Design a protein around this motif. Structure first.
Motif, PDB file in Angstrom:
ATOM      1  N   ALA A  21       0.829  -1.200   0.000  1.00  0.00           N
ATOM      2  CA  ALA A  21       0.000   0.000   0.000  1.00  0.00           C
ATOM      3  C   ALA A  21       0.866   1.254   0.000  1.00  0.00           C
ATOM      4  O   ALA A  21       0.576   2.229  -0.703  1.00  0.00           O
ATOM      5  CB  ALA A  21      -0.932  -0.016   1.212  1.00  0.00           C
ATOM      6  N   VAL A  22       1.946   1.240   0.784  1.00  0.00           N
ATOM      7  CA  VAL A  22       2.869   2.373   0.822  1.00  0.00           C
ATOM      8  C   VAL A  22       3.447   2.623  -0.565  1.00  0.00           C
ATOM      9  O   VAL A  22       3.507   3.761  -1.044  1.00  0.00           O
ATOM     10  CB  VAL A  22       3.979   2.122   1.857  1.00  0.00           C
ATOM     11  N   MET A  23       3.898   1.554  -1.223  1.00  0.00           N
ATOM     12  CA  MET A  23       4.493   1.687  -2.548  1.00  0.00           C
ATOM     13  C   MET A  23       3.465   2.167  -3.562  1.00  0.00           C
ATOM     14  O   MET A  23       3.773   2.977  -4.442  1.00  0.00           O
ATOM     15  CB  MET A  23       5.074   0.344  -2.985  1.00  0.00           C
ATOM     16  N   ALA A  24       2.240   1.649  -3.472  1.00  0.00           N
ATOM     17  CA  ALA A  24       1.175   2.109  -4.353  1.00  0.00           C
ATOM     18  C   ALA A  24       0.961   3.604  -4.188  1.00  0.00           C
ATOM     19  O   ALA A  24       0.836   4.340  -5.172  1.00  0.00           O
ATOM     20  CB  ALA A  24      -0.112   1.347  -4.044  1.00  0.00           C
ATOM     21  N   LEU A  25       0.923   4.071  -2.939  1.00  0.00           N
ATOM     22  CA  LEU A  25       0.772   5.498  -2.689  1.00  0.00           C
ATOM     23  C   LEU A  25       1.939   6.282  -3.273  1.00  0.00           C
ATOM     24  O   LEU A  25       1.744   7.319  -3.910  1.00  0.00           O
ATOM     25  CB  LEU A  25       0.649   5.754  -1.188  1.00  0.00           C
ATOM     26  N   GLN A  26       3.165   5.807  -3.056  1.00  0.00           N
ATOM     27  CA  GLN A  26       4.328   6.519  -3.577  1.00  0.00           C
ATOM     28  C   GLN A  26       4.258   6.641  -5.094  1.00  0.00           C
ATOM     29  O   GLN A  26       4.465   7.725  -5.657  1.00  0.00           O
ATOM     30  CB  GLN A  26       5.613   5.805  -3.151  1.00  0.00           C
ATOM     31  N   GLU A  27       3.968   5.531  -5.773  1.00  0.00           N
ATOM     32  CA  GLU A  27       3.874   5.548  -7.229  1.00  0.00           C
ATOM     33  C   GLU A  27       2.766   6.482  -7.694  1.00  0.00           C
ATOM     34  O   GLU A  27       2.966   7.298  -8.601  1.00  0.00           O
ATOM     35  CB  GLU A  27       3.621   4.133  -7.747  1.00  0.00           C
ATOM     36  N   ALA A  28       1.579   6.361  -7.096  1.00  0.00           N
ATOM     37  CA  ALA A  28       0.458   7.201  -7.493  1.00  0.00           C
ATOM     38  C   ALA A  28       0.787   8.672  -7.291  1.00  0.00           C
ATOM     39  O   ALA A  28       0.470   9.515  -8.135  1.00  0.00           O
ATOM     40  CB  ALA A  28      -0.781   6.811  -6.686  1.00  0.00           C
ATOM     41  N   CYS A  29       1.439   8.995  -6.174  1.00  0.00           N
ATOM     42  CA  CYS A  29       1.763  10.383  -5.876  1.00  0.00           C
ATOM     43  C   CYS A  29       2.781  10.926  -6.863  1.00  0.00           C
ATOM     44  O   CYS A  29       2.632  12.042  -7.367  1.00  0.00           O
ATOM     45  CB  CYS A  29       2.293  10.499  -4.447  1.00  0.00           C
ATOM     46  N   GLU A  30       3.837  10.161  -7.142  1.00  0.00           N
ATOM     47  CA  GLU A  30       4.832  10.637  -8.095  1.00  0.00           C
ATOM     48  C   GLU A  30       4.220  10.798  -9.482  1.00  0.00           C
ATOM     49  O   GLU A  30       4.484  11.783 -10.175  1.00  0.00           O
ATOM     50  CB  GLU A  30       6.050   9.711  -8.113  1.00  0.00           C
ATOM     51  N   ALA A  31       3.367   9.855  -9.888  1.00  0.00           N
ATOM     52  CA  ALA A  31       2.697   9.962 -11.179  1.00  0.00           C
ATOM     53  C   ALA A  31       1.839  11.220 -11.245  1.00  0.00           C
ATOM     54  O   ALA A  31       1.933  12.012 -12.193  1.00  0.00           O
ATOM     55  CB  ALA A  31       1.840   8.714 -11.409  1.00  0.00           C
ATOM     56  N   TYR A  32       0.983  11.412 -10.240  1.00  0.00           N
ATOM     57  CA  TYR A  32       0.115  12.582 -10.205  1.00  0.00           C
ATOM     58  C   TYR A  32       0.931  13.866 -10.223  1.00  0.00           C
ATOM     59  O   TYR A  32       0.642  14.791 -10.992  1.00  0.00           O
ATOM     60  CB  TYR A  32      -0.754  12.532  -8.948  1.00  0.00           C
TER      61      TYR A  32
END
Lengths: 89, 91, 314, 103, 290, 81, 57, 50, 91, 81, 103, 91
Positions: free
Chosen positions: I49-60
DNA sequence: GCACGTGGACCACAAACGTGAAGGGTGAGGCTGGAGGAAAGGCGTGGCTTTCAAAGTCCCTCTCCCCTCAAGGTCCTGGACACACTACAAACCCAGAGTTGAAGCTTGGGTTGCATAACGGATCCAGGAACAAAGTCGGGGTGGGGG
DNA sequence: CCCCCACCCCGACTTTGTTCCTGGATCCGTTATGCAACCCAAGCTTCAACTCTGGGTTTGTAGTGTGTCCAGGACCTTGAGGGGAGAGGGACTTTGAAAGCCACGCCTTTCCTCCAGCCTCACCCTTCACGTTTGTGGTCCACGTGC
């Protein structure tokens, strides 16, 4: 259609006012739109939890997700009171 | 003659105050049929459907115009350019 | 704004006519909705005729009557010479805990002690008079009478032993199309605090919020008109400061049940208004929770005023 | 009617039938229709309240689509809930950017 | 043709409507003396105005007045001035209508009651919310007895807000005791006390029974009024009632009153506990005249 | 049927821009706007016609327009739903 | 109808005459029987002179 | 002769209209007003100004 | 030093070719748990979940920065300003 | 804890902006970026927490993050589902 | 095997079951899952072909999320279909505006 | 639990026999497959409802495909589904 | 010269008018609710053991911090021209009307259909073993800038 | 254009994950029965299509003036680039036990069925609100004429 109930609601809010047929159609469309949003969100929630029944929990969750916090608090209070009064009698 | 822009402000106030359709309905309807024929000929339309189309188009265009106006303002400009529309659409 | 102005003026003419029709219809007897304007005028025509005929052939006195009856701790009562009650004022319930329906048509001697029946029978039966065509009965000194007796109180639990109150009748004998006696009955023992037994409005309500110490966190705009206290006069104080002595225990039971279930409906109880009247209430409660852990944060309380008849029924 | 038992205006029976149709789930808990009807009635009340305010502010007694548009775009939460929604003869808020103002 | 025809019957039904309405307007006018006396065709609007303008009790008035006691008075909330008073005040305060009307109630009040009456005169078919009731001391034309204790009960009423009330001079003695044959309710007064016995709440029946006005009891200890012969018994009851929820009823005991004498009372006591906090809020007492 | 895109008059575009608060307009906008509108409207029409076709109907109904707008994030009130 | 027009016309002329009389009554060196035009001329001169004399007092 | 008398009445009514306008010129309110005032209004304003 | 911009272009190439997260992990975790505590305490989190958040945040964030760059270019600027971000978000 | 938003260092933001092709950056950006990111995170976290709570769990799973992003209109592949 | 009947790789039985789940409808025609499986297989083939071409361009012989990102963002139709998807470890297209290049 | 790795891999060997796929890319592909399935299924459900139909047939799917897919992809996908259903019906 | 008359002007009322909007009434039947039962979904208890929490330590990249200096943002200035504003002319849109019938919609008939269940059965899933892929570290080649 | 420096991608080695083989099953598929969802043929009436006439507000085309957009010079300050130092991050390792999952037993909740009966919907009749004209009269005036 929900015209009867829309009218009755207005008669409880602004008894001294009326509604144009176009505004009434807008309200019917809005009601069905929100109904669809909530029903679909609740359907997803039940699926995400492999459940077969939609209850007030699912609706409360869907409301909290869909509505902004202010309206969510008031709407949750209204659903709570309605369910309370109904179940109590 | 009034000065350029003053009449435009009176017009802005007028048209924001009003709610009526701004496109001529018959040109719009024939444009619809001119497009629709490409997908299917011998096709009929409920007049209400045509009105819904026109209202959606005017709303969409008005929103795009407002966004484009913000773009022009950001560029510190009054006259909107196709660059502004293109930037808004790209965004 | 030229034709907008003329249309404004014409819509104003329309409005003024509508306002006058509404005012005209509002004063009528037997008022009802859905009357067409022609029916409003027709009912006004009939009402003008009837009122003019009845009056021609005949501060507000109602407010004075209420104020004096309350100050005296009294109520109007009318009974036939046979002892049967024919009318009574509602204030009797606040003073003797009997409803008017418990009194009317019943024998007064069911409420007077048996050891005093002969006296009141003598009072009612010894007096007989026939009036002339010129003088009303209530104005003649012969018809006036002042006397005293005991009267039984009502109760919420019939297990309570019979309890009575000494009262003075101040009244006169009057003929009806039989001969009755009608009197203002005053309690000999004054009642500096009393219970409101009938709600003066069809329904009235007020809302508040309470802490986990039951102290007021909020009071709505509808409370002060009902209970007489302004919000700042109650905020921070315990809700128990306003409840009736006997109802304290039942209300503690209700709040224990609320702590058990989180939501529900209360028993009937009494609340002391700033105007020194105990008003009967019933309340709906529910609790709200602190999202961080789902534990309570405050209780919401919706209070409804209720009648002594509904209280005594359950 | 369950709506009456809930003190509600909306038709709980209809709501339950509609939720039982549309294939939203295999079963429907009895409290769900009541809860939803309450939510709908509440939102309806809020919207109609704002609309009537708008009408009276312009001395009108009848609610028209323009009043709904004004109410919805003025109210921030409704503007969020209905940001992408369009309304017939809705119009717009009389927004004018300051740079456009003459002096 | 069919559309035009459908419009004829409807439009002439509307004609029937305006004919009916004008007929009824004229009839209503006929029932208004001013409109009937007016020669000219009064317009429907003026006719309606004149109609709304144009639109036993004495037996009841005597039935209640003969039973009246004390005196009625009206005092302006914003004024403090007595706007009206009944003649019966001369029996009570010995001042006449002319001595009271046009003068302010507050000098007739005792200085320590002026503040109380002012609090009562503050705003918040006569409704319980507008209701006001208080004991106070009022001056008399012939004099410590320069004042007498009056029970005032009334309601607030409206351009100048005012309290409409009756002031009654009740006897502090209890005439006509109850007959042994009949169970009659004795006089009672409720009070609530802090842990040490100091009054934190008291009612007006306490003022009728003890002569002390409410502020004279609040903020004082019950032990300042208990008679020493009974203070041991009452203190035992106090020590016991602190430990239990049960209602304890005392024996008959003596209690001191404003004039310096003692009266006999019997009391029911309990320590009430708030369930939310599981703590005793205060001692609750119902006192009874013996 | 031809040239009905010209039926969208320069004054109509000006009025729409004014409703959009626009104070000044470049001439290129008129053709740019006509193109953007043609694209948007053609997509909506394609969807509505697709609904009509699936229904095996020969008349476009407002409900099809509503569905086309809905699925494109253009929810519209006033024509049922 | 004609009676009412006569009434309103006499009312018009009576209001005019009452106003002419009030206007002329405030003048200095007052004398009755002056023609309407003379009343107005003397009023014009009186207003001029009174205004100037009062302002420059 | 009657024509001459009636036109003397016209000379008189013209003289009165002229002096009503002149009197109006001495009244600030009348001097400020836009519409061609009715005679009674002008005279009322004049007696109010004095 | 190299002239400003050149090394920035090299950095841009590097980060566009790369795919790894540009943010520090533990600060990100602490920030997540700092935010999450306000909604509910005693929470546990899967590293996925942490990694998903990191990826989503960097993408956004990178998409938002691209739009911001477009706005700055439209404003004839190389350097992005908060107004660019505000405008892009609003649009 | 607190103040971990400053843990989003200026070099990290520089790297991110550079991935967005950004050639130059104003200092005001960093705090504005932190605020925007805080809002974004707060929304996503609220939704994910809501999912978890309805499931009566105490552990946040990536599936909840994905459902939150889905309903927010942003889809992320490669974390299950 | 139904997939064999259709000449397809994807499992028709699974697709059919998934369609009976989710409450999508009361009934499902036999050809429905076949058509859907064919469409899914076609789209999958398009993506995988483009991704393998990208890998080969990157001199690689195994597909990684970077390749999928590049492929999908380069194909205009897929890019339009999947514009709002995020790809784990995808990176971004190497796009730099001419205005930023030195001159 | 179920995934499409088998069929993804077999299809890869159809288009690029020389090429393999990483588990990360495989996860991407499975997410994609599930996403497209959801899109099509939801659209077809709406379609059937809009037409008061209780059954989903290949017509509903073809219509949903035409609505969802861009033109070129739509033509090819429609031809493919047509061929597949034709062969399956013949077999 | 004044007053009244009539025509004219102007105002505003007053009423009906018909039209448009709305509401009340009666029909009416669909839909809500209740009874009754079945059995499936959910609550509940009891147990485990997988995963995240939480921490320790060392190595090290990455961050912190400081300064310089040119480039980019910015401000300020000037030009002209693409746009707005007015005008007359025209047209096609709008409104209202008429006329025609393809298609919408309902009824009845009959079918083919898909669900469901039992039963058959063999390809798929969990697990065990071996090989290839993934992660980490180091080297080589490519790309751009500066001289 | 050539050389130097930095970055990007590939290659090698080690550890972990995936694929292929094995056993058991239940997911997939078939064949059957059943009740019926939907297609089909047919007829009936409607709304939309299609057309016209007439009006006139909107639209089109044209002329003229300037506010806006753009270019340009020029300052000056802010970010970048690097250097250099230091710290918490990152990676890897560890343990604890809490929470989620699982399985077992009970029961009660709601679907399904049938029915009853009344609230919501449609139509029909009737009324009210409205603008809006007009009628209609009055107020009043402008100046005639009469008295």
């Amino acid at each position: 259609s929900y015209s009867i109930y829309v009218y009755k609601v207005l008669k409880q809010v602004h008894p001294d006012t009326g509604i144009s047929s176009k505004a009434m159609g807008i309200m019917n469309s809005f009601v069905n739109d929100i109904f669809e949003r909530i029903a679909g969100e609740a359907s997803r929630l039940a699926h995400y939890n492999k459940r077969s029944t939609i209850t007030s929990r699912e609706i409360q969750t869907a409301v909290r997700l869909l509505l902004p916090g202010e309206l969510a608090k008031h709407a949750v209070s209204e659903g709570t009171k309605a369910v309370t009064k109904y179940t109590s009698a | 003659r009034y000065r350029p822009g003053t009449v435009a402000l009176r017009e802005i106030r007028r048209y924001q105050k009003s709610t009526e359709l701004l496109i001529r309905k018959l040109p719009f309807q024939r444009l619809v049929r001119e497009i629709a024929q490409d997908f299917k000929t011998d096709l009929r339309f409920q007049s209400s459907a045509v009105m819904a189309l026109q209202e959606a188009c005017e709303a969409y265009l008005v929103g795009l115009f407002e966004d484009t106006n913000l773009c022009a303002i950001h560029a510190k400009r009054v006259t909107i350019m196709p660059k502004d529309i293109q930037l808004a659409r790209r965004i | 704004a030229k034709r907008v102005s003329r249309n404004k003026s014409e819509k104003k003419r329309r409005d003024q006519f509508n306002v006058l029709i509404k005012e005209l219809g509002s004063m009528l007897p037997g008022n009802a909705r859905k009357m067409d304007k022609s029916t409003v005028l027709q009912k006004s025509i009939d009402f003008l005729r009837k009122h003019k005929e009845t009056t021609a052939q005949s501060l507000s006195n109602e407010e004075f009557t209420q104020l004096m009856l309350e100050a005296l701790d009294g109520f109007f009562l009318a009974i036939m010479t046979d002892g049967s009650i024919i009318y009574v004022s509602e204030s009797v319930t606040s003073l003797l805990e009997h409803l008017p329906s418990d009194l009317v048509d019943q024998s007064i001697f069911n409420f007077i002690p048996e050891g005093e029946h002969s006296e009141v029978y003598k009072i009612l039966s010894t007096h007989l008079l026939e009036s002339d065509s010129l003088t009303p009965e209530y104005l003649k000194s012969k018809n006036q009478l002042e006397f005293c007796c005991h009267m039984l109180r009502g109760t919420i639990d019939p297990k309570e032993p019979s309890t009575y109150e000494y009262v003075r009748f101040i009244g006169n004998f009057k003929s009806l199309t039989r001969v009755c006696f009608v009197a203002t009955v005053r309690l000999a023992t004054p009642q500096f605090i009393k219970e409101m037994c009938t709600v003066e409005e069809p329904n009235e309500e007020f809302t508040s919020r309470h802490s986990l110490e039951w102290k007021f966190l909020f009071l709505d705009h509808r409370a002060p008109p009902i209970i007489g206290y302004l919000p700042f006069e109650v905020l921070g104080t315990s809700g128990y400061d306003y409840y009736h002595v006997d109802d304290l225990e039942n209300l503690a039971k209700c709040h224990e049940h609320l702590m058990q279930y989180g939501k529900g409906k209360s028993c009937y109880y009494r609340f002391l208004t700033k105007g020194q009247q105990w008003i009967w209430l019933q309340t709906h409660y529910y609790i709200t929770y602190h999202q961080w852990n789902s534990r309570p944060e405050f209780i919401v309380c919706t209070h409804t005023v209720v009648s002594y008849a509904e209280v005594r029924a359950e | 009617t369950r709506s009456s038992r809930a003190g509600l205006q909306f038709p709980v029976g209809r709501v339950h039938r509609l939720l039982r149709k549309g294939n939203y789930s295999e079963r429907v808990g009895a409290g769900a229709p009541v809860y939803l009807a309450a939510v709908l009635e509440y939102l309806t009340a809020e919207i109609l309240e704002l609309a009537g305010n708008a009408a009276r502010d312009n001395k009108k007694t009848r609610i028209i689509p323009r009043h709904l548009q004004l109410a919805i775009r003025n109210d921030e939460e409704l503007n969020k809930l209905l940001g992408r929604v369009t309304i017939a003869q809705g119009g717009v808020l009389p927004n004018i950017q300051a740079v456009l103002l003459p002096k | 043709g069919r559309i035009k025809n459908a419009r004829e019957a409807h439009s002439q039904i509307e004609k029937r409507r305006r004919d009916k309405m004008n007929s009824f307007i004229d009839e209503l006018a006929s029932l208004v003396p001013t409109c009937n006396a007016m020669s000219r065709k009064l317009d429907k609007l003026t006719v309606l105005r004149m109609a709304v303008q144009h639109m036993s009790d004495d037996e009841l008035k005597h039935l209640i007045l003969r039973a009246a006691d004390g005196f009625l008075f009206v005092v302006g909330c914003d004024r403090g001035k007595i706007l009206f008073v009944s003649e019966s005040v001369f029996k009570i305060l010995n001042y006449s209508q002319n001595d009271l009307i046009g003068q302010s109630l507050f000098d007739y009040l005792h200085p320590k009651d002026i503040a109380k009456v002012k609090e009562q005169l503050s705003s918040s078919r006569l409704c319980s919310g507008a209701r006001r009731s208080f004991f106070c001391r009022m001056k008399c034309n012939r004099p410590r007895k320069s004042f007498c204790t009056i029970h005032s009960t009334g309601y607030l009423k409206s351009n100048l807000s005012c309290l409409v009330a009756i002031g009654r001079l009740h006897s502090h003695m209890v005439p006509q005791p109850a007959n042994g044959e009949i169970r009659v309710k004795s006089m009672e007064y409720v009070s609530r006390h802090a842990i040490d016995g100091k009054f934190v709440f008291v009612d007006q029946r306490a003022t009728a029974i003890l002569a002390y006005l409410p502020q004279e009891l609040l903020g004082t200890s019950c032990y300042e009024y208990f008679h020493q012969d009974d203070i041991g018994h009452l203190a035992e009851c106090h020590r016991q009632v602190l430990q239990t929820r049960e209602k304890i009823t005392t024996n008959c005991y003596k209690f001191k009153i404003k004039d310096g004498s003692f009266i006999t009372l019997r009391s029911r006591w309990f320590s009430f506990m708030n369930p939310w906090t599981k703590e005793v809020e205060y001692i609750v007492s119902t006192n009874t005249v013996v | 049927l031809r040239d009905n895109i010209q039926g969208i008059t320069k004054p109509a575009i000006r009025r729409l821009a004014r409703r959009g608060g626009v104070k000044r307009i470049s001439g290129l906008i008129y053709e740019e706007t006509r193109g953007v509108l043609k694209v948007f409207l053609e997509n909506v029409i394609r969807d509505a016609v697709t609904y009509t076709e699936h229904a095996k109907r020969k008349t476009v109904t407002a409900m099809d327009v509503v569905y086309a707008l809905k699925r494109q994030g253009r929810t519209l009130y006033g024509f049922g739903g | 109808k004609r009676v009412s027009r006569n009434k309103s016309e006499k009312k018009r002329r009576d209001q005019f005459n009452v106003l002419i009389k009030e206007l002329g009554s405030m003048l200095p060196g007052n004398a009755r029987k002056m023609d309407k035009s003379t009343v107005l001329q003397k009023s014009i001169d009186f207003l001029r002179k009174h205004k100037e004399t009062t302002a420059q007092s | 002769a009657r024509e001459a008398h009636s036109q003397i009445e016209k000379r008189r009514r013209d003289k009165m209209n002229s002096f009503i306008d002149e009197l109006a010129s001495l009244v600030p309110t009348c001097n400020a007003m836009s519409r061609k005032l009715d005679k009674l209004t002008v005279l009322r304003m004049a007696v109010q100004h004095m």
